[PDB]
């Protein structure tokens, strides 16, 4: 059965991997969730994108 990602999954996979501000372990806590379950990709991309706001340098 063919699980590869439609384009809305795919654009938070990438978005996850290349957002400038999370630390490793950030960064690979949210990848894990996707590659557990991609259904949930919206809210969790909407987590990492409010982290990474917060943590941008001034
Ligand atoms: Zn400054």
Same mark, same amino acid.
């Given at each position: 059965?063919?699980?590869?990602?439609?384009? #809305? !999954?795919? *654009?938070? /996979?990438?978005?996850? $991997?290349?957002?400038?501000?999370?630390?490793? #372990? !950030?960064? *690979?806590? /949210?990848?894990?969730? $996707?590659?557990?379950?991609?259904?949930?990709?919206?809210?969790?991309?909407?987590?990492?994108?409010? $982290?990474?706001?917060?943590?941008?340098?001034?």
């Amino acid at each position: 059965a063919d699980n590869k990602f439609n384009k #809305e !999954q795919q *654009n938070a /996979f990438y978005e996850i $991997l290349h957002l400038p501000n999370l630390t490793e #372990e !950030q960064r *690979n806590g /949210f990848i894990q969730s $996707l590659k557990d379950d991609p259904s949930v990709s919206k809210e969790i991309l909407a987590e990492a994108k409010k $982290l990474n706001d917060a943590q941008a340098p001034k």
